[PDB]
RNA sequence: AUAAUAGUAAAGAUGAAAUAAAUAAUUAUAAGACUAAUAUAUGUGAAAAUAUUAAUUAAAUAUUAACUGACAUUGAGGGAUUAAAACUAGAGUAGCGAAACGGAUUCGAUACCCGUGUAGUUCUAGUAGUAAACUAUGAAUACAAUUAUUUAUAUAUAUAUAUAUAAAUAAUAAAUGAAAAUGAAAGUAUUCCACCUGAAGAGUACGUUAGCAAUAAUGAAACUCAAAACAAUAGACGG
């Protein structure tokens, strides 16, 4: 009956492509009065709690730390960008609830992010991380890719 | 026949195709 | 029932890079422990005294100790010696 | 230390006969090398004689032959006959299309 | 021809989970018996969680009541039943697979045949001679 | 209602993808190693790379044929090496 | 500006067919775009060597030769100037007809038709907007 | 692709670059095309082809029993089917992508790389009958020495193997061959069809036939030359 938005967990998503690394920190917000609403079916309640809304808090790329052009897709650019994210999560008091890490692709920044989170740079965030997962998107047939490059 | 020998036929076919395209073009202007 | 795969006749039976068991250096493991001992109890802590004494003796004359475990694999000698006998080739 | 890793010690079953070699490291290594899932046949429905296509509405049994992501396992891993592998794959694909797997 | 229908009905009311399934089985059963068809068996499979969230008629679902219906009908009637199931909002997923009767006239449901019971007589004779 | 509140835990994990690991709060680097093993046992990195550029069906078929042969060839090679080792052990 | 400058090879022994078919087209097309062009003339042996540009960096006068040689060499320069007449300004020849020479052509006055890329982007935007309009109609029919 | 949401200032691309309230993230909607694992194209199909699911119709296996009683093989002409591209109409058009216009690279770059991307790629109804349409190997029958591995059928039991008879595949003996190799044929024989007679000219010219068209089929001669080609050998060289 009253909006009671509360954070349930945080999602640390990393997209590691060939030319850049994108790191997004989000909050899974849950209106704790949703079940108190009128005209709400058992299915709508279960469907609302199975995919809770998300709000973006921190969005970073390798170009936000001053890496330009070809340097954006390198191991060092990702390692420093991961550090800046782990710092901004502590400077915003967003290290109270559990964090779920979602990795998307297999570029050069995937192993830098993992190294920065299992090392000194991520000794605070790692303590809250509860689940790691992979979200690489594959196609079963799907659209035709571009032709092979003759180099 | 080997690729080497096939290449001679390839050149002859290319020149015939090139000549027929050229003839076509003329017919269009002359038509 | 387990599918047996039979090779065609081959010019050779050879392992490109035969694997060998290389025992770890005793002095390096001692150094890896002492370094860890200092990481927990602190540098020069009295708890790592024995480690320091052992490390000094291991490296006193040679920093890697008496390395006398060099080995080479004999699989390629036997493989070439026995291939004609065990390949199951039909008679001429 | 009064403790040894389980991988470095062999536990001789009860009622079995042993030789002095059974206390050596060679036995440990030999048991690892020749460690195959041969007891699957007696626990493998698809290696018993049933038709795998009769299990297209039983996702729990079919989920034993797919990886964590649902990828059908190659015959080299399942150890099934050509016919059963062919029938099992059809069952899984039909199960996926029905909305059960 | 003998056919095996597997339908995933929607569970709208958590209080009456097996309500739309009963209403649907009656609708399908009536079509079969009113068009020269025979209904051999109706095996409920219970409420199960769907492998994923599925959609139907601009609605989403996370669970469904599974049920099997072994029936005998003509090909034309079988297509009519499938068409009605593909249109009913209650049905989330429906599949009809033919059960070959070339070698024997009495075949049990795939679920039962998977358990070793090949005919309905074997199932009935295990409920009378031993029950 | 609460019926839709107390049955969300299983429901949440009932629709799993199989690409998730529960982190070991003690050794968090062992959980990332487990996740990498899943990726390699489902060929996720390989499939992604193979989907970047289109390959003609004929070329795809050739590559699939050659790969199978190399896989089968290696199994036949290992079978022959095992025979060599067994023969050597018995003095042949 | 180095992009505007395009280096070209015109050997002294070139045939007036290649000179008036390939080289003429190359020079004329480049000049029409607005790219500067420097034409380097030299003997076939040294002109086209690995040190194509490097040898010309090397740039007692060269001795005279049979007039036939200079009839060819001077004829080439006449053809070059006549070919590049309305497409560029007067040339700055820097060398001797008895040796290497660097003709330095410069594009003639040409206004900037830079408003072409504006149309390009506008057309792309128009197509995208038309696609959206079409997709709205699909959603409407689906709803209806 | 669009919209919303918070959240920002770069993003995207490349060998490196540059051309054209975002990117990323979480939702919702729409559209077209495609079909991950299994998977070996194994198998099936005359070939071309054929691997997401179900159904309908058609065809396809082995053995046994009975029946017909040479009714067979091959096959000029003929007929049917036939990848991709292309073409004629009507739809569709996400992604890909000749061309075109741009950005780079380069001594130059009418290319390789990048962008925007039209035809085409998709479906329906047709035209056309061409591919390294290849196993570069027409079809059928009789026959000849072995092994291994699967598959199928059958038999037996001291119930899970064992013993048989076929098929397939792999490696071979003999034989054949210019050799490379073939291996149940490229062997020993028989029957029928197609095709070839130095290179180049030329699958061209002309004519004819067919097609909306692109084209497809048929298919020469003159002049010139003493060449031209295959397998294998030893070298030299290889970004
Ligand atoms: K095949
Ligand atoms: K007779
Ligand atoms: K006849
Ligand atoms: K004929
Ligand atoms: K299109
Ligand atoms: K024939
Ligand atoms: Mg890079
Ligand atoms: Mg493109
Ligand atoms: Mg020939
Ligand atoms: Mg986006
Ligand atoms: Mg597939
Ligand atoms: Mg085959
Ligand atoms: Mg015939
Ligand atoms: Mg094809
Ligand atoms: Mg059209
Ligand atoms: Mg261009
Ligand atoms: Mg240019
Ligand atoms: Mg392009
Ligand atoms: Mg036709
Ligand atoms: Mg042709
Ligand atoms: Mg032909
Ligand atoms: Mg083909
Ligand atoms: Mg026949
Ligand atoms: Mg012709
Ligand atoms: Mg040769």
Full set of structural domains in chain E with CATH:
2-124 (3.30.70.60)
CB distance E51–D59 less than 8 Å? yes
Cβ proximity of G32 and G110 under 8 Å: yes
DSSP conformation class of G88: B
Q: Nearest nt to A81, CA vs C1'?
A: H24
Work out the angle at residue A70's Cα, subtended by the Cα atoms of residues A67 and A73, and round it to the nearest 5 degrees. 75
Percent of chain G as helix, strand, coil, to the nearest 5: 50, 10, 35
Chain E residues in contact with D61 by the CB 8 A cut-off are 114
- CA–CA distance, A75 with A107 (Å, rounded to integer): 9
Sign, Cα dihedral of E67, E70, E75, E81: negative
What are the residues whose beta carbon lies below 5 Å from ligand 7 (ion)? A 73
E96: the nucleotide nearest its CA (via C1') is H54
Q: How far is the CA of C44 from the centre of ligand 2 (A)?
A: 114
Cα-based angle E12, E14, E17 (whole degrees, multiple of 5): 80
CA of F6 to C1' of H40 (A): 49
Can you give the distance from the CA of residue A131 to the C1' of nucleotide H38 in angstroms? 30
Q: Do D54 and E110 touch (CB under 8 A)?
A: yes
Cβ contact A46:E62 at 8 Å = yes
Radius of gyration of chain E, Cα coordinates, nearest whole angstrom: 16
**What is the extent of the structural domain holding D73?**
44-100
Cα angle value G133/G138/G144 (rounded, 5°)? 125
State the Cα torsion F36-F40-F44-F49 to the nearest 10°. Answer: 110
Q: What span, in angstroms and rounded, lies between the C-alpha atoms of E64 and E54?
A: 10
For residue E20, the SS3 value is helix
Structure tokens belonging to residue F61: 């078929």
Sign of the dihedral defined by the CA atoms of residues A83, A87, A89, A95, in that order: positive
Q: E77 near E3, Cβ under 8 Å?
A: no
Q: How far is CA F60 from CA E108, F55, F66, in A?
A: 44, 6, 10
Q: Which two tokens stand for residue A33?
A: 């009065």
Sort out which chain A residues have CB atoms less than 8 A from F1's CB and list them.
35, 42, 45
Coil, strand or helix: which one is A4? coil
Stretch 45-74 of chain E: residues touching chain A, C-beta under 8 Å = 53, 60-62
**Burial call C50-75: b when 16+ CB within 10 Å, e when fewer:** ebeebbeebbeeeeebeeeeeeeeeb
Q: Which nucleotides of H are covered by protein (CB under 7 A)?
A: 1-3, 5-20, 23-42, 52-57, 93-97, 101-102, 104-110, 112-114, 116-117, 132, 136, 146-152, 160, 170-173, 200-205, 214-215, 229-231
| Closest C-alpha among A83, E14, G36, A110 to residue F4 | E14
Burial (CB < 10 A; 0-12, 13-18, 19+), residue E94, is: buried
Q: Distance in angstroms, CA of E7 to C1' of H90?
A: 40
Q: Do E53 and F15 count as a contact with CB atoms less than 8 A apart?
A: yes
Q: Tokens 């020749």 — which residue?
A: D34
d(CA D54, CA D84): 12
Question: Smallest Cβ distance to A46: which of E12, E13, E62?
Answer: E62
Nearest nucleotide to the CA of F53, by C1', is H96
Give me the long-range contacts of G1-4 (CB less than 8 A, separation at least 24): G1/G36, G3/G35, G4/G34, G4/G35, G4/G36, G4/G107
* Nominal resolution (angstroms): 2.9
Q: Do F14 and E49 touch (CB under 8 A)?
A: yes
The owner of tokens 């058992």 is A42
Distances from the Cα of C71 to the Cαs of C19, C20, C64, D25, in angstroms?
10, 7, 17, 20
**What is the full DSSP assignment across D39-66?**
THHHH-GGGTT--GGGGTT-HHHHGGGB
- Experimental method for this entry? cryo-EM
Residue from A100, D68, A109, D75 nearest F39 by CA: D68
Long-range contacts of C46-54 (CB under 8 A, 24+ apart): C54/C30
The shortest CB-CB distance from F79 to any of C5, C78, C83 is to C5
Is there a contact between A10 and A26 (Cβ–Cβ < 8 Å)?
yes
What torsion, rounded to 10 degrees, do the Cα atoms A55, A58, A61, A66 define? Answer: 150
- Is the separation of the CB atoms in E5 and E95 below 8 Å? yes
Q: Please tell me which of the candidates C5, C78, C85 has its beta carbon nearest to residue F72.
A: C5
Query: What gap in Å lies between CA G142 and CA G144, rounded to an integer?
Result: 5
Ordered strands of the G94-95 beta sheet: G6-9, G37-41, G101-105, G94-95
Closest CA to G72 of G95, G47, G97, G90: G97
Alpha-carbon gap, residue C44 to C34, rounded angstroms: 10
Contact at CB, F11 and E51, closer than 8 angstroms: no
Give residue C81 CA to ligand 23 midpoint distance, Å: 53
């Amino acid at each position: 009956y009253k909006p009671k938005e509360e954070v349930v967990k945080y999602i640390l998503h990393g997209k590691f492509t060939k030319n850049n690394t994108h790191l997004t920190f989000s909050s899974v917000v849950e209106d704790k009065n949703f079940h108190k609403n009128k005209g709400l079916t058992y299915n709508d309640t279960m469907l609302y709690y199975l995919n809770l809304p998300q709000k973006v808090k921190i969005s970073l790329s390798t170009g936000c730390l001053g890496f330009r052009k070809a340097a954006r897709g390198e191991y060092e650019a990702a390692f420093q960008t991961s550090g800046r994210m782990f710092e901004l999560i502590k400077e915003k008091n967003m290290l109270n609830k559990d964090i779920e890490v979602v990795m998307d692709d297999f570029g050069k920044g995937r192993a830098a992010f993992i190294s920065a989170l299992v090392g000194k740079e991520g000794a605070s965030v790692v303590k809250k991380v509860v689940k790691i997962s992979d979200a690489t998107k594959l196609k079963f047939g799907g659209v035709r890719s571009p032709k092979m490059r003759r180099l | 026949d080997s690729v080497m020998r096939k290449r001679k036929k390839k050149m002859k076919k290319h020149k015939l195709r090139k000549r027929r395209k050229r003839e076509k073009a003329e017919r269009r202007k002359l038509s | 029932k387990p599918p047996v795969y039979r090779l065609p006749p081959l010019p050779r039976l050879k392992v490109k890079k035969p694997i060998i068991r290389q025992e770890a250096n005793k002095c390096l493991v001692l150094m890896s422990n002492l370094l860890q001992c200092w990481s927990s109890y602190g540098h020069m802590s009295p708890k790592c005294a024995g480690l320091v004494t052992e490390l000094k003796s291991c490296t006193s004359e040679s920093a890697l100790g008496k390395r006398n475990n060099v080995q080479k694999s004999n699989i390629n000698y036997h493989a070439a010696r026995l291939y004609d006998r065990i390949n199951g080739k039909p008679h001429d | 230390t009064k403790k040894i890793d389980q991988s470095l010690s062999k536990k001789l079953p009860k009622g079995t006969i042993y030789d002095p070699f059974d206390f050596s490291m060679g036995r440990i290594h030999l048991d690892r090398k020749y460690q195959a899932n041969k007891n699957s046949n007696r626990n493998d429905i698809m290696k018993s004689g049933a038709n795998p296509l009769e299990f297209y509405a039983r996702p729990r049994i079919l989920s034993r032959y797919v990886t964590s992501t649902g990828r059908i396992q190659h015959r080299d891993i399942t150890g099934l006959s050509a016919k059963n592998q062919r029938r099992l794959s059809k069952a899984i694909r039909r199960c996926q299309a029905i909305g059960l797997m | 021809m003998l056919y095996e229908l597997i339908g995933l009905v929607r569970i709208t009311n958590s209080n009456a989970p097996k309500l739309e399934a009963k209403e649907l089985s009656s609708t399908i059963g009536k079509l079969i018996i009113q068009n020269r068809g025979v209904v051999r068996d109706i095996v409920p499979m219970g409420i199960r969680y769907l492998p994923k969230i599925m959609k139907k008629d601009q609605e989403k679902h996370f669970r469904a009541y599974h049920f099997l219906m072994l029936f005998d009908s003509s090909a034309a009637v079988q297509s009519e039943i499938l068409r009605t199931l593909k249109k009913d909002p209650r049905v989330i997923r429906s599949s009809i697979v033919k059960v070959d009767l070339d070698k024997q006239l009495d075949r049990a449901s795939s679920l039962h045949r998977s358990l070793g019971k090949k005919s309905i007589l074997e199932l009935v004779n295990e409920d009378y001679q031993s029950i | 209602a609460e019926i839709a509140r107390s049955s969300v835990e299983n429901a949440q994990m009932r629709f799993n993808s199989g690409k998730s690991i529960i982190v070991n709060k003690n050794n968090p680097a062992e959980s990332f190693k487990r996740l990498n093993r899943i990726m390699f046992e489902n060929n996720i990195p390989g499939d992604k790379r193979s989907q970047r550029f289109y390959m003609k069906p004929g070329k795809v078929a050739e590559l699939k044929r050659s790969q199978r042969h190399r896989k089968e060839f290696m199994m036949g090679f290992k079978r022959l090496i095992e025979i060599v080792k067994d023969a050597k052990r018995k003095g042949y | 500006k180095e992009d505007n400058l395009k280096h070209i090879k015109i050997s002294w022994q070139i045939e007036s067919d290649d000179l008036k078919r390939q080289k003429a087209h190359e020079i004329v097309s480049l000049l029409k775009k607005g790219n500067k062009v420097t034409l380097y003339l030299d003997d076939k042996n040294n002109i086209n060597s690995n040190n194509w540009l490097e040898n010309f960096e090397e740039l007692g006068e060269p001795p005279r030769l049979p007039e036939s040689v200079f009839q060819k060499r001077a004829a080439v320069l006449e053809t070059l100037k006549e070919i590049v007449s309305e497409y560029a300004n007067d040339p700055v020849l820097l060398g001797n007809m008895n040796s290497k020479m660097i003709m330095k052509l410069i594009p003639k006055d040409v206004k900037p038709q830079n408003n072409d890329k504006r149309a390009l982007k506008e057309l792309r935007k128009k197509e995208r907007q038309e696609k959206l309009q079409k997709r709205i109609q699909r959603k409407k029919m689906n709803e209806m």
